[PDB]
PDB file of C-alpha atoms in Angstrom:
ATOM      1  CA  UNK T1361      34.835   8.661   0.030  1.00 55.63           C
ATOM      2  CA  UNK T1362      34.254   5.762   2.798  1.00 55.42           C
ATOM      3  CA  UNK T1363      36.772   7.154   4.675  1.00 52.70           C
ATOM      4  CA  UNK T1364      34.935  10.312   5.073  1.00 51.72           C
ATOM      5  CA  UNK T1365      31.464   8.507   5.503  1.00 51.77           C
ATOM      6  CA  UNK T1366      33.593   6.465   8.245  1.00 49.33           C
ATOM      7  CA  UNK T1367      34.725   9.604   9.929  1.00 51.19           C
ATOM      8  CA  UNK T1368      31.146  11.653   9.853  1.00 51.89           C
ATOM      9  CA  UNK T1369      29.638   8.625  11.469  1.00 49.85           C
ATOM     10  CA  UNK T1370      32.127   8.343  13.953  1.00 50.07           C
ATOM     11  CA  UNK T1371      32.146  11.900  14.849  1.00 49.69           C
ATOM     12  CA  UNK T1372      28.790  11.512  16.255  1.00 53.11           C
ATOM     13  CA  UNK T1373      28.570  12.411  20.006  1.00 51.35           C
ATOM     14  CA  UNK T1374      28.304   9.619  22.352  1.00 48.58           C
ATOM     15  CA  UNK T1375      25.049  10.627  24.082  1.00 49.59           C
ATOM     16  CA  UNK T1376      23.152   9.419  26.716  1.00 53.55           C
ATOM     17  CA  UNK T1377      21.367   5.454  26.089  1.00 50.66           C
ATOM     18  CA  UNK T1378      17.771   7.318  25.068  1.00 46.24           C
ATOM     19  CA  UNK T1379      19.022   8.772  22.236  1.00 43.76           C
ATOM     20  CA  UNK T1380      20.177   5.919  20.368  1.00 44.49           C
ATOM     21  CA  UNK T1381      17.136   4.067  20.774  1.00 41.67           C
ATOM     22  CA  UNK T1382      15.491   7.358  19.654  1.00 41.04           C
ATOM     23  CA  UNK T1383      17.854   7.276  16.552  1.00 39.96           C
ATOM     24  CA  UNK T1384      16.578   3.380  15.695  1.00 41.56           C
ATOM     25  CA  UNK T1385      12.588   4.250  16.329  1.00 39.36           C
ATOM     26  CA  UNK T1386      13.039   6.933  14.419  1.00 41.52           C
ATOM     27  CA  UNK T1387      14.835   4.836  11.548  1.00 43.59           C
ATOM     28  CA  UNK T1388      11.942   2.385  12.006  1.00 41.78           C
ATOM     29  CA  UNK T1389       9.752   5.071  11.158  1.00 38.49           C
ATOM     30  CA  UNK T1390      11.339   6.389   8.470  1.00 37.73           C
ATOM     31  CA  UNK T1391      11.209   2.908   6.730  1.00 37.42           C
ATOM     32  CA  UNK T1392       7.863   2.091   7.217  1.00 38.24           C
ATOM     33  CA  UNK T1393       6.745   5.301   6.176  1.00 38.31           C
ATOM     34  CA  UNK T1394       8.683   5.101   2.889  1.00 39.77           C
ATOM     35  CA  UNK T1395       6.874   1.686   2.320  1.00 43.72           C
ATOM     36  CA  UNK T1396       3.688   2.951   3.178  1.00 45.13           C
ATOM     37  CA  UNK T1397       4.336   5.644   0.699  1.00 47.55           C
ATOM     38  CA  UNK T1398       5.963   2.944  -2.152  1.00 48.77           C
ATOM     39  CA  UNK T1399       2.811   0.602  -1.324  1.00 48.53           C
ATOM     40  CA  UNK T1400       0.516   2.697  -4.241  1.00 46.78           C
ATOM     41  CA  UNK T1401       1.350   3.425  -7.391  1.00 51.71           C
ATOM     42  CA  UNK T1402       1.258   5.432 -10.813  1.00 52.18           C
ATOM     43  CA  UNK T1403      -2.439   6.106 -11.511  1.00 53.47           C
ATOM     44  CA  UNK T1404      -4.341   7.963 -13.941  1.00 53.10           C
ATOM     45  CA  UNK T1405      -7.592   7.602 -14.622  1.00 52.26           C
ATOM     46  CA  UNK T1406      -8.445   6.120 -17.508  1.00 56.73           C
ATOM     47  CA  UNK T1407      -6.143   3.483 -16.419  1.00 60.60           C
ATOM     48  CA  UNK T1408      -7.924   0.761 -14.211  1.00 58.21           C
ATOM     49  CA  UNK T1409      -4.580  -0.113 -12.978  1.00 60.05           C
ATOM     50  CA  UNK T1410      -5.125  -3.515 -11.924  1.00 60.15           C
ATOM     51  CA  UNK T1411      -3.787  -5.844  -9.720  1.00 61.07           C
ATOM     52  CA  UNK T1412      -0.921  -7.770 -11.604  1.00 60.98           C
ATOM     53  CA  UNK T1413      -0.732 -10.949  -9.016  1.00 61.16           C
ATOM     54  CA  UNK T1414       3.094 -12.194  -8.968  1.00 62.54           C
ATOM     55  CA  UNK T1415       1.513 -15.842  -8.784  1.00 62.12           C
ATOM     56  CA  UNK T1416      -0.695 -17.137 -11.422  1.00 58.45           C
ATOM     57  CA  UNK T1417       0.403 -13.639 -13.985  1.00 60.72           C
ATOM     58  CA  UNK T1418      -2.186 -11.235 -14.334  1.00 63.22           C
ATOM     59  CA  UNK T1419      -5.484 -11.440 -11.455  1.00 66.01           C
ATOM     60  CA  UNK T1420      -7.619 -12.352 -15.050  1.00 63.92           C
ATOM     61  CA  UNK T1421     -10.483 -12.034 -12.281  1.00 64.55           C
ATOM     62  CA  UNK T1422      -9.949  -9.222 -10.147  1.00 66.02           C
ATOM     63  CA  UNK T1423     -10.621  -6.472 -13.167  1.00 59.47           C
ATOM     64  CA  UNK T1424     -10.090  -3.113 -11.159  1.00 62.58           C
ATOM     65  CA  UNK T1425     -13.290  -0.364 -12.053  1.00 62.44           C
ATOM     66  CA  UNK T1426     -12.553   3.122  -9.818  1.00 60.60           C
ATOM     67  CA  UNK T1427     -11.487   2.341  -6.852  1.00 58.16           C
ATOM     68  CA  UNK T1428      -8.297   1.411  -4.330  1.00 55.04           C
ATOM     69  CA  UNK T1429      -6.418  -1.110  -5.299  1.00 54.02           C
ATOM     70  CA  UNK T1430      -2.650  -1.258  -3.033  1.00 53.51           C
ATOM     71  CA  UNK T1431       0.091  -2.950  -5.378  1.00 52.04           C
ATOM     72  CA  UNK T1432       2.357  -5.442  -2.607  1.00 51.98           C
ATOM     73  CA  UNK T1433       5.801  -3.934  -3.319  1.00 48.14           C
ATOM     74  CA  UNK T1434       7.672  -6.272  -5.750  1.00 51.99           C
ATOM     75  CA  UNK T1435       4.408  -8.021  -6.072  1.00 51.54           C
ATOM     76  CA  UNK T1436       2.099  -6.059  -8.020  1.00 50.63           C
ATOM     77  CA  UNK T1437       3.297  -4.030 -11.220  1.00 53.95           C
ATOM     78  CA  UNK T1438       0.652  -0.780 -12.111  1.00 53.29           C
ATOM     79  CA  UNK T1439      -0.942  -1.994 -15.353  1.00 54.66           C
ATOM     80  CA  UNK T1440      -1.507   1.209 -16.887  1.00 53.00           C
ATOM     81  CA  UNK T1441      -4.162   0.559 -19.542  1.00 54.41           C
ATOM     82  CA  UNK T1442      -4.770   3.662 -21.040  1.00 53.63           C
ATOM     83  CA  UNK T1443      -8.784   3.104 -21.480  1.00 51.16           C
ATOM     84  CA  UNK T1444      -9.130   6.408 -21.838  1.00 52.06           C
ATOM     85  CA  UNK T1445     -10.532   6.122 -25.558  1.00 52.66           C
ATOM     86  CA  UNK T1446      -7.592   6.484 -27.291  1.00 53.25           C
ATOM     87  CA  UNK T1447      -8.543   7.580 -31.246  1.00 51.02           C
ATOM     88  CA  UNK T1448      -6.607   6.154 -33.540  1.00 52.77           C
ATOM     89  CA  UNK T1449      -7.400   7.339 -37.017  1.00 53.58           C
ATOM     90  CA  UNK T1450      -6.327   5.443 -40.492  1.00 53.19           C
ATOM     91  CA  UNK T1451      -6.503   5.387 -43.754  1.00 53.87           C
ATOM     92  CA  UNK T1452      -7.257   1.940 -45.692  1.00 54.60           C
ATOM     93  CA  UNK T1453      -7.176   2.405 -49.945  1.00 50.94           C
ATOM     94  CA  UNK T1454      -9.712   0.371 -51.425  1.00 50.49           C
ATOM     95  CA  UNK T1455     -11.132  -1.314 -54.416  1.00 52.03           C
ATOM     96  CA  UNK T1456     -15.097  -1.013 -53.971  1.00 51.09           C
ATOM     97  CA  UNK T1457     -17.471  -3.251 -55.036  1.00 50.37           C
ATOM     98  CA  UNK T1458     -17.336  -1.897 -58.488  1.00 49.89           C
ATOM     99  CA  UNK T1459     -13.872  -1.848 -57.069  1.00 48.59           C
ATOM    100  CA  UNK T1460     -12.878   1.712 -58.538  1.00 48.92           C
ATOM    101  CA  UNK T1461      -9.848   2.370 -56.127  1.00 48.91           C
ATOM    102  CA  UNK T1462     -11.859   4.623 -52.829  1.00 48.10           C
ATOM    103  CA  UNK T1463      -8.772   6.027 -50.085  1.00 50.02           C
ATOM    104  CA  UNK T1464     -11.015   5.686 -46.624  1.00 48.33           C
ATOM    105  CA  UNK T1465      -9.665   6.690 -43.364  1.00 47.71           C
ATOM    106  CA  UNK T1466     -11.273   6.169 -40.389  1.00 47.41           C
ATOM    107  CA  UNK T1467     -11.306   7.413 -36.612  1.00 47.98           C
ATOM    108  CA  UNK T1468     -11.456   4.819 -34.748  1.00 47.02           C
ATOM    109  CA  UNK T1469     -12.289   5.369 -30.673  1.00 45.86           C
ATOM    110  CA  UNK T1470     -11.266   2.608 -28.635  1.00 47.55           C
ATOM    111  CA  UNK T1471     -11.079   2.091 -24.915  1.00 53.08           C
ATOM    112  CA  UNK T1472     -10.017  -1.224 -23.224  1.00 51.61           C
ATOM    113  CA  UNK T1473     -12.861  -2.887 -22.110  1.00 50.35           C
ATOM    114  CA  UNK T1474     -12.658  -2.366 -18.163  1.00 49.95           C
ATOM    115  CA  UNK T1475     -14.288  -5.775 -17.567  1.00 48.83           C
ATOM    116  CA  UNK T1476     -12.165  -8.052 -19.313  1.00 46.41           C
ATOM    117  CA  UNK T1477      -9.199  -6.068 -18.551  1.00 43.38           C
ATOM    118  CA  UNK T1478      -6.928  -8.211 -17.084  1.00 44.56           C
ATOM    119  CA  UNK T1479      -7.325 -10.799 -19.752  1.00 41.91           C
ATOM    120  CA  UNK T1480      -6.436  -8.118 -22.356  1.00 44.57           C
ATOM    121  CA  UNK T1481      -2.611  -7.694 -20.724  1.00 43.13           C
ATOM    122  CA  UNK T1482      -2.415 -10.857 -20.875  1.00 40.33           C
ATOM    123  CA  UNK T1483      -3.472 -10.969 -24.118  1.00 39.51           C
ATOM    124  CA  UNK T1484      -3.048  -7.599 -25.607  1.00 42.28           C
ATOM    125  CA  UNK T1485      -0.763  -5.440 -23.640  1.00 41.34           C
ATOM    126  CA  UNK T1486      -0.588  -1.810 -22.616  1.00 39.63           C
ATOM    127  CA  UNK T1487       0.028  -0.370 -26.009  1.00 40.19           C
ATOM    128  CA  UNK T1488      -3.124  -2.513 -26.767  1.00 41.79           C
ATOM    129  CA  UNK T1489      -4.218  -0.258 -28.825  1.00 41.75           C
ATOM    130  CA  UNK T1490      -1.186   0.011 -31.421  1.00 41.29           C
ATOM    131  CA  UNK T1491      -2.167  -3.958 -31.120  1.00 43.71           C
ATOM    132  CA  UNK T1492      -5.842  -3.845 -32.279  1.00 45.35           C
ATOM    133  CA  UNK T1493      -6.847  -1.228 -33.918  1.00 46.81           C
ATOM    134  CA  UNK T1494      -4.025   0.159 -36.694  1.00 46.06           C
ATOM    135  CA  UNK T1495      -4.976  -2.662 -38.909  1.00 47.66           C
ATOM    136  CA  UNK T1496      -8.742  -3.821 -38.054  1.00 46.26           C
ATOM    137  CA  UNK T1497      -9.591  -0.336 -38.992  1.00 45.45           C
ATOM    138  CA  UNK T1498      -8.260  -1.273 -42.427  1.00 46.71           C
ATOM    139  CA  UNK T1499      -9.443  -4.103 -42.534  1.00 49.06           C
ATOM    140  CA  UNK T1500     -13.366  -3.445 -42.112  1.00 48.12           C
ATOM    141  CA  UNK T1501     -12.861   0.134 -43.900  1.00 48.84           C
ATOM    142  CA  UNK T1502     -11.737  -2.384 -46.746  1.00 44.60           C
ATOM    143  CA  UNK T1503     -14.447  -5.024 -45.970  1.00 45.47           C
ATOM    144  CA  UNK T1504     -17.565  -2.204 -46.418  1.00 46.24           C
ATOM    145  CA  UNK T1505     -15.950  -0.389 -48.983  1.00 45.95           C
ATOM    146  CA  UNK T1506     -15.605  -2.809 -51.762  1.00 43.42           C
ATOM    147  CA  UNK T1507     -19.363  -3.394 -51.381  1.00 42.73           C
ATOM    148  CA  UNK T1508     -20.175  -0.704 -52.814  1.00 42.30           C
ATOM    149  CA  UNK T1509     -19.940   1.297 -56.404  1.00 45.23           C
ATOM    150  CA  UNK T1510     -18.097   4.440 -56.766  1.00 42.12           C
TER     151      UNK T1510
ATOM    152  CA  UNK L1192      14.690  26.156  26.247  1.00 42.46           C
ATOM    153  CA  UNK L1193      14.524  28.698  22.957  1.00 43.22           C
ATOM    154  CA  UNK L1194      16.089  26.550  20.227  1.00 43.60           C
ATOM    155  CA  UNK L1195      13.917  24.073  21.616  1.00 44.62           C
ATOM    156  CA  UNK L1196      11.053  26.612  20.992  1.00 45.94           C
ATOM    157  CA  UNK L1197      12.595  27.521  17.299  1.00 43.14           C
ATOM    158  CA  UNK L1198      13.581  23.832  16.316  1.00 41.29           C
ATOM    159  CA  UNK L1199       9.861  22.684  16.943  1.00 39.14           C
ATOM    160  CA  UNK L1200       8.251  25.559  15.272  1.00 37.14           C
ATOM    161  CA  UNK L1201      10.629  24.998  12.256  1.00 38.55           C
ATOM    162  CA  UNK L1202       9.415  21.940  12.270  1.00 36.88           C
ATOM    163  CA  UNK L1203       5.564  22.920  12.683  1.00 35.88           C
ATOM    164  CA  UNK L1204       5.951  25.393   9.755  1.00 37.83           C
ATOM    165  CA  UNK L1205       7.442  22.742   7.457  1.00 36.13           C
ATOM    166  CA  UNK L1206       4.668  20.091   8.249  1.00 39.45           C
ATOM    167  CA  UNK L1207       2.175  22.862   7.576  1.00 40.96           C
ATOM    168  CA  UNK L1208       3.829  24.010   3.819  1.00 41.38           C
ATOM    169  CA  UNK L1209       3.534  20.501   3.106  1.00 43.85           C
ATOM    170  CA  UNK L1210       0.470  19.410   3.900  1.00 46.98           C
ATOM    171  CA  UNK L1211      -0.940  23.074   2.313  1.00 43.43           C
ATOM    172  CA  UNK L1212       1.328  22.056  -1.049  1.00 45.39           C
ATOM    173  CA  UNK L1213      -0.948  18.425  -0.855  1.00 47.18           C
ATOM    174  CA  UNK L1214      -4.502  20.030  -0.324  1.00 47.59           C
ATOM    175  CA  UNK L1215      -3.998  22.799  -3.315  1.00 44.17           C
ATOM    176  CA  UNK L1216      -2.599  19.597  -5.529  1.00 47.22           C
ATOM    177  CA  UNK L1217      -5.359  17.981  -4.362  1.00 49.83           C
ATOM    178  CA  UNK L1218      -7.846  19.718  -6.077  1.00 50.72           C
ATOM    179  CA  UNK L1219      -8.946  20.826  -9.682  1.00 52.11           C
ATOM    180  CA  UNK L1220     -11.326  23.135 -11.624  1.00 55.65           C
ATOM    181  CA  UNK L1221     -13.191  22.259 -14.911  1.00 59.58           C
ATOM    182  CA  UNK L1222     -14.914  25.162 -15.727  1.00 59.88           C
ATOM    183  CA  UNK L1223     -18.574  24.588 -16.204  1.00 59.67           C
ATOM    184  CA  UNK L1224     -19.896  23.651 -19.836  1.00 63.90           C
ATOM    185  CA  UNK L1225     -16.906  21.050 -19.417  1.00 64.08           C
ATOM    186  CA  UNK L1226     -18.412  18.227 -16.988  1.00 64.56           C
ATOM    187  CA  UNK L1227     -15.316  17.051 -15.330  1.00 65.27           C
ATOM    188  CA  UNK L1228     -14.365  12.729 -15.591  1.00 68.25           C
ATOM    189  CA  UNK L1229     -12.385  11.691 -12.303  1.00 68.11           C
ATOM    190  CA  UNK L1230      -9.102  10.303 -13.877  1.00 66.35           C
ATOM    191  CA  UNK L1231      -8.377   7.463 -11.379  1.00 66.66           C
ATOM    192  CA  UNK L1232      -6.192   4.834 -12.367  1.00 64.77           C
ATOM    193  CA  UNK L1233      -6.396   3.039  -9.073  1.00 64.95           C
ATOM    194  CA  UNK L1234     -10.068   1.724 -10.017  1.00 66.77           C
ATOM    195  CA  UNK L1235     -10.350   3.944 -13.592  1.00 68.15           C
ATOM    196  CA  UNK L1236     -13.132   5.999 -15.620  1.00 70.45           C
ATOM    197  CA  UNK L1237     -16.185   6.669 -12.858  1.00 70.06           C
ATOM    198  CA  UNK L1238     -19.391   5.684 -14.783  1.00 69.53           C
ATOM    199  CA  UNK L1239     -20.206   8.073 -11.324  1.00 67.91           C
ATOM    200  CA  UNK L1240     -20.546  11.238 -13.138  1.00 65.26           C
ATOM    201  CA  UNK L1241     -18.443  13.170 -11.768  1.00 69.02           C
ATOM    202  CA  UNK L1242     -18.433  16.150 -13.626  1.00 66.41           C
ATOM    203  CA  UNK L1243     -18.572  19.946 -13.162  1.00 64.09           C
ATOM    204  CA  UNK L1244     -17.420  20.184  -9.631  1.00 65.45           C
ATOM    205  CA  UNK L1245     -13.805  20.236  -7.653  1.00 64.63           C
ATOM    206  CA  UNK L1246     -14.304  16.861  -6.425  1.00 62.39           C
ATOM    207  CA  UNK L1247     -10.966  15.959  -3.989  1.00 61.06           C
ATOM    208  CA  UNK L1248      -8.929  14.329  -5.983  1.00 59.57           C
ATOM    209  CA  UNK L1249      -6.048  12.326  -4.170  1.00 58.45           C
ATOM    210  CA  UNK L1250      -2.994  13.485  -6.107  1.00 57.57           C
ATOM    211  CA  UNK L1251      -0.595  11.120  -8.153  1.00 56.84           C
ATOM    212  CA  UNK L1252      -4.436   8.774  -8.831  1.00 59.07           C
ATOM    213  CA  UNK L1253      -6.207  11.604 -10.363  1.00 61.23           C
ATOM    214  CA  UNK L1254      -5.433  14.227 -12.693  1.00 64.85           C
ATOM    215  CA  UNK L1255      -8.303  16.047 -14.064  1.00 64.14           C
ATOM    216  CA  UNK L1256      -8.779  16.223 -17.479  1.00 61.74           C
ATOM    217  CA  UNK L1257     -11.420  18.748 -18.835  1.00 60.86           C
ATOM    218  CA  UNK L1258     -14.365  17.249 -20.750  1.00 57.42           C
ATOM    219  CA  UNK L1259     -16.786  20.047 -22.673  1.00 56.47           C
TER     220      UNK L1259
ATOM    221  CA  UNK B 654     -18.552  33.315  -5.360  1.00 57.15           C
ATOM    222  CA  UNK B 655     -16.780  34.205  -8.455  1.00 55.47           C
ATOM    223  CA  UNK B 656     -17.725  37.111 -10.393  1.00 57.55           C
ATOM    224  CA  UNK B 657     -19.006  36.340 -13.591  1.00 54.36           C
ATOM    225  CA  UNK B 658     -17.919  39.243 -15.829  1.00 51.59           C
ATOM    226  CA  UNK B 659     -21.001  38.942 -18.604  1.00 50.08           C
ATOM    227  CA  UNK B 660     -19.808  41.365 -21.414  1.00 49.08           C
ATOM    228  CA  UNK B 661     -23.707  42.129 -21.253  1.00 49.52           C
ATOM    229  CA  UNK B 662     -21.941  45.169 -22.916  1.00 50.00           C
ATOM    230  CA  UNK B 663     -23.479  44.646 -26.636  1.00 47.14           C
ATOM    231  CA  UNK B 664     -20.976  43.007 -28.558  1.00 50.04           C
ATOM    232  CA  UNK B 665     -21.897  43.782 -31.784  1.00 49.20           C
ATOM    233  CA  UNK B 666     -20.011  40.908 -33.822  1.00 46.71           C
ATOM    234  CA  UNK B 667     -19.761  41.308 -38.027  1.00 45.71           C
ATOM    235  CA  UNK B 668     -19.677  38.191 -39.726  1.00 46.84           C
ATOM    236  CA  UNK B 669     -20.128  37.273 -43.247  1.00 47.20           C
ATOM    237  CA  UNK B 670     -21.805  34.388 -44.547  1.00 48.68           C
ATOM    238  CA  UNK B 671     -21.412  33.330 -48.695  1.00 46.26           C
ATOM    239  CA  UNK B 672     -24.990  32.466 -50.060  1.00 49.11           C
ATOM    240  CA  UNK B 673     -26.239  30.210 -52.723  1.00 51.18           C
ATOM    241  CA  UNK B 674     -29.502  32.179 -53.171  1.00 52.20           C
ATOM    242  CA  UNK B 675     -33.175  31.186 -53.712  1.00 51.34           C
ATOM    243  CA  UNK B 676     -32.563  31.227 -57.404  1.00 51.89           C
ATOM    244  CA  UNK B 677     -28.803  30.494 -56.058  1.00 51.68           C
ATOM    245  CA  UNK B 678     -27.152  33.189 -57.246  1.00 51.05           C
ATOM    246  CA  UNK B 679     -23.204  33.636 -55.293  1.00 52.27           C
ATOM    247  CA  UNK B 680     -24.422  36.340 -53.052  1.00 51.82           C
ATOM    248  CA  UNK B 681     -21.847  37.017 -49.960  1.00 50.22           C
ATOM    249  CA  UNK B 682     -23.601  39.090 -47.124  1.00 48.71           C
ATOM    250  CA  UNK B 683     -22.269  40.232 -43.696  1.00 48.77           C
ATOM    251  CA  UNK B 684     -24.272  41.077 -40.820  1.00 48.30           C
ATOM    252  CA  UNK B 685     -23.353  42.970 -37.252  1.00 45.01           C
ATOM    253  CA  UNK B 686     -25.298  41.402 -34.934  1.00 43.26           C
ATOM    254  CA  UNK B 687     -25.537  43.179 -31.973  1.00 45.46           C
ATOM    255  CA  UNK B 688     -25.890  40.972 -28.918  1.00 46.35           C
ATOM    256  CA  UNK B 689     -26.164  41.470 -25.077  1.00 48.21           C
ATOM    257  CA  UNK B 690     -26.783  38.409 -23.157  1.00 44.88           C
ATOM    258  CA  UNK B 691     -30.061  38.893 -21.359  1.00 45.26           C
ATOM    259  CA  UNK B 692     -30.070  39.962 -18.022  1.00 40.95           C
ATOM    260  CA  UNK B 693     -33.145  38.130 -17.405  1.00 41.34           C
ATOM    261  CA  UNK B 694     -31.805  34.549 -17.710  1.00 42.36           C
ATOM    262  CA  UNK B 695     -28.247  35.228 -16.976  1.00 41.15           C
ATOM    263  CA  UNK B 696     -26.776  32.906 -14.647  1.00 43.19           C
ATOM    264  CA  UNK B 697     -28.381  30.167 -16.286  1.00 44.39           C
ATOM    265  CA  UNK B 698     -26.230  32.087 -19.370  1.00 43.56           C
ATOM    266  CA  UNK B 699     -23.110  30.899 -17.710  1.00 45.83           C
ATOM    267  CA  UNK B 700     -24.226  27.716 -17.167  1.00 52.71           C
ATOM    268  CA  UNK B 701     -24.627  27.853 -20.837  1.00 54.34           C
ATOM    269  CA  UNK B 702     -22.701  29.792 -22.416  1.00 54.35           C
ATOM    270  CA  UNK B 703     -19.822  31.249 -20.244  1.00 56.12           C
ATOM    271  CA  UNK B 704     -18.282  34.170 -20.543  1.00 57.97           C
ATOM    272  CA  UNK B 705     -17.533  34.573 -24.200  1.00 55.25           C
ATOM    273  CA  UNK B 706     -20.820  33.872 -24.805  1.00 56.75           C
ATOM    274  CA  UNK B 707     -21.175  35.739 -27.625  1.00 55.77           C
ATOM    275  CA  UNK B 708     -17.997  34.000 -29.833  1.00 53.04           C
ATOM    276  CA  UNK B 709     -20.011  31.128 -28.065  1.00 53.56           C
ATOM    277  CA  UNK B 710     -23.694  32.055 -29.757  1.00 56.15           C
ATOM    278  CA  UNK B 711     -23.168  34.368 -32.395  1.00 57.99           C
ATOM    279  CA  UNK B 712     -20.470  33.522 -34.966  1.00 59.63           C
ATOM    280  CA  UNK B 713     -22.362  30.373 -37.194  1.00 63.17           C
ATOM    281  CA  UNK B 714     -26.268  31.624 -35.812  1.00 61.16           C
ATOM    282  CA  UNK B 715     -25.523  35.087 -37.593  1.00 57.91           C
ATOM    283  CA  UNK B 716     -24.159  33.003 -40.672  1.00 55.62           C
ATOM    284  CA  UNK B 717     -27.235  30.385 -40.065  1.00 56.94           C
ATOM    285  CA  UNK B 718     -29.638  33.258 -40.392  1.00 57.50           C
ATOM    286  CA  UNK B 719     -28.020  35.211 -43.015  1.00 60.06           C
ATOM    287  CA  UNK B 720     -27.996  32.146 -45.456  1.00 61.80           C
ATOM    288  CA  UNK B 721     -31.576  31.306 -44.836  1.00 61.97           C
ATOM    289  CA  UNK B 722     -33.001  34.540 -45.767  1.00 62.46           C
ATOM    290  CA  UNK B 723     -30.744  35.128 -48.601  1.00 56.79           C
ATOM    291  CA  UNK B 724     -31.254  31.696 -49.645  1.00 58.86           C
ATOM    292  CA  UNK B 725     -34.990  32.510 -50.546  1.00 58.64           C
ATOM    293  CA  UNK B 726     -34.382  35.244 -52.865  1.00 58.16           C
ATOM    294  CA  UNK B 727     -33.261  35.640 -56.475  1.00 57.50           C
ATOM    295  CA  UNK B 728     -29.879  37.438 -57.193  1.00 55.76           C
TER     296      UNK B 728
END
């Protein structure tokens, strides 16, 4: 296969000394454009995609509300927090006050606070939510519950 | 001096599909009675209602999702 | 401009409501409610209600009213 890559490349015509330079401006363009391009990334909103700094971990300052925000290629990973409120309903069994045994599930709306953000990747994650609320739902369903009869 | 012609009309047309293909992905309709929320995730949620309205929405940052 | 089809057409919609009545008797009554959406304050209708306005109005306020008034009866 290099063979044939080594032929095709050979084959082309020996112009005139504007074209080549034409060839490597037009390279040049090519490549900056595609970093241009690269220099955003995946965004959806409900995601304050902040700036992950390469130096230092996550910018625990710089907490991203709507706006611009241009990730330095191999600098800067998209955190993708999903604050859209993400629901998460559960059940929690319970022994009320009087402690007769009460099954309460509850649907529970969470979205990542925007402006501490950055300190919840580096504390929570982007399946934050899987890492909060599955079990403090249960917990204060549980808490309330068993302070009260049936 | 008529490829010439044909080469940079090609090239004209193709530019011009493009850029139409951007605009109409650019924009989005949430009917009325459903108050629209600008899903950027370059910045995030816009406490600036955006709502009922085809706001331009740069494509790959904001995909509109339909609030009633 | 996009033309906003109002079925101002009455749609007469039938819709049965079950009723605990005044004395509470189980008595189930239907009604065919038979709405057009007024010309009069139409545009602000589709600002309000849309276009299936009337699946949008009429299917719980016809059960609503029916309940009410068969609510304050005996069987």
């Amino acid at each position: 296969m290099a063979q044939n890559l080594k032929d095709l490349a050979g084959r082309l015509p020996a112009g005139p000394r504007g074209m080549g330079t034409a060839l490597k401006l037009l390279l040049g363009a090519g490549a900056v454009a595609y970093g241009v391009r690269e220099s955003v990334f995946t965004v959806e909103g409900g995601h304050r995609a902040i700036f992950f700094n390469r130096i230092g971990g996550v910018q625990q300052d710089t907490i991203l509300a709507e706006g611009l925000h241009f990730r330095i290629p191999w600098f800067q990973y998209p955190i993708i927090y999903d604050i859209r409120a993400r629901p998460r309903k559960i059940s929690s069994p319970t022994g009320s006050k009087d402690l007769q045994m009460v099954n309460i599930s509850l649907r529970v709306l969470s979205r990542p606070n925007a402006q501490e953000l950055p300190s919840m990747y580096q504390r929570l994650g982007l399946d934050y939510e899987e890492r909060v609320l599955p079990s403090i739902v249960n917990e204060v369903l549980k808490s309330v519950v068993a302070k009260f009869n049936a | 001096m008529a490829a010439k012609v044909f080469e940079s009309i090609g090239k004209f047309g193709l530019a011009l599909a493009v850029a139409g293909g951007v605009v109409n992905s650019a924009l989005y309709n949430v009917d009325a009675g459903h108050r629209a929320v600008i899903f950027d995730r370059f910045r995030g949620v816009q406490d600036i209602v955006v709502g009922e309205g085809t706001h331009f929405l740069i494509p790959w940052v904001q995909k509109p999702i339909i609030f009633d």
